[PDB]
Design a protein around this ligand. Structure first.
Ligand code: A1B4Z
Ligand code: ZN
Length: 139
């Protein structure tokens, strides 16, 4: 679990969005596993606007942060789960690092701000949904 709170927006994994997120929907994209909802309170986070390929992510299944080198956002095949059929997920970045079911929502940050959230993983890989291209989150 986990979310990004920026301005009057809450960014979550689309597959973990609540009834309240869907009732206050701003934007969602199944191909990216993202959903953004509106908030009444002002958010605590700031978004990176950069091309960093290294950073640090929070891994809830270890209660720890780990440094990672990750690929540029791209279209990656993701196997079927209870949440989605087998499909290509877009704007996904992969890295070597621990992740297991329940780690989705952990933030990846570089020195410039929030880069994205955990969205996939397994067998010593961790995948992050990029948010750096969503320029409207800042306005
Ligand atoms: N973005 C998706 O399609 C994910 C929806 C939830 C399921 N999913 C996963 O990868 C779960 C997973 N399994 C093993 N290690 C880590 C993780 Cl996060 C795929
Ligand atoms: Zn950066």
């Amino acid at each position: 679990s986990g979310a990004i709170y920026v301005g009057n927006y809450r960014v979550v994994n689309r597959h973990l969005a609540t009834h309240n997120d869907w009732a206050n929907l701003v934007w969602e994209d199944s191909s990216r596993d993202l959903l953004v909802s509106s908030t009444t309170a002002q958010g605590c986070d700031t978004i990176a606007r950069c091309d960093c390929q290294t950073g640090v992510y929070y891994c809830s299944s270890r209660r720890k942060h780990y440094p990672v080198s990750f690929s540029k956002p791209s279209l990656i095949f993701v196997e079927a789960s209870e949440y989605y059929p087998a499909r290509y997920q877009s704007h996904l970045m992969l890295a070597v690092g621990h992740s297991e079911p329940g780690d989705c929502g952990g933030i990846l940050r570089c020195q410039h701000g929030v880069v994205g959230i955990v969205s996939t993983g397994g067998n010593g890989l961790v995948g992050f949904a990029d948010v750096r291209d969503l320029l409207w989150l800042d306005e």
